[PDB]
Amino acid sequence: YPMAVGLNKGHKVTKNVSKPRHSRRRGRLTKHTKFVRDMIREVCGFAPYERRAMELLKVSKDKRALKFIKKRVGTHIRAKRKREELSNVLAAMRKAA
């Protein structure tokens, strides 16, 4: 039975779920730019904070590496994504025998 507040809040209308707009297609997978970036990483090299964060994530401590990335770039979620990216680069390059 419908009412104002609670769990099923508001007037009951039917949904109109369709395909989203093109503006959601902003930062997606994009295999061509993935090829561009994955080439140019080993074209250029790495930043100095990245080069010592790979050492701190290799031998010293993952928590200390996350704290160093949190100090060098902006926020905690940025530190999480940068830590996962550096760990993926580490395990993909320096573990292939």
Partner: protein, 203 residues
């Protein structure tokens, strides 16, 4: 085909392949003068996405500014007022150094029109920009009507009224709840509309 590679190589500007070229260019530009005509853009992708096209009438000025905040020009650090304003050492000048470079380029050449500008260098003191200038009286710019907006006399000296990219970014205007201080037009227009004591015939 190439400009995305140029962009992505410019993005990570701390890597070893870029910082060598950046240090060499900063030395090369520090040993130059303050305001001079670079014959071609050193950043073609950034210049083209700001509005450079390789044709007759677009002029790149390389310009050097001095870093740091401003010192209040009062003599001997004396303000002669309340203790709100004795801070002679620290005022930080609400326009950016990129806007200062645009002002200096357009005021050195008022015959040109400042379109945009972009960073090319820094060491500790001298910040280096390149400013693109449109020539409003060349025939290739007075034709091609995607460019004829800057020929019209309402765009004379955009750099000193605050119409360029760095000018708007220094004014701080945008749609949102973060910009109620300048709700429309400018912050002085907002001050005008919010302190105009409105009266009417019938009250």
């Amino acid at each position: 085909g190439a400009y995305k590679y140029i962009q992505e190589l410019w993005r990570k500007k701390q890597s070893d392949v870029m910082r060598f070229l950046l240090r060499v260019r900063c030395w090369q530009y520090r040993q130059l003068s303050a305001l001079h005509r670079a014959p071609r853009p050193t950043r073609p992708d950034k210049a083209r996405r700001l509005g450079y096209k390789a044709k007759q009438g677009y002029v790149i000025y390389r310009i050097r500014v001095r870093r740091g905040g401003r010192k209040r020009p009062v003599p001997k650090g004396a303000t002669y007022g309340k203790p709100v304003h004795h801070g002679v050492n620290q005022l930080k000048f609400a326009r950016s150094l990129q806007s200062v470079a645009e002002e200096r380029a357009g005021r050195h050449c008022g015959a040109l029109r400042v379109l945009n500008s972009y960073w090319v260098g820094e060491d500790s003191t001298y910040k280096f920009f390149e400013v693109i200038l449109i020539d409003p009286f060349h025939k290739a710019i007075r034709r091609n009507p995607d460019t004829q907006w800057i020929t019209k006399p309402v765009h004379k000296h955009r750099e000193m009224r605050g119409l360029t990219s760095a000018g708007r970014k220094s004014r701080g205007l945008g749609k949102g709840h973060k910009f109620h201080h300048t709700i429309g037009g400018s912050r002085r227009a907002a001050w005008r509309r919010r302190n105009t004591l409105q009266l009417h015939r019938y009250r």
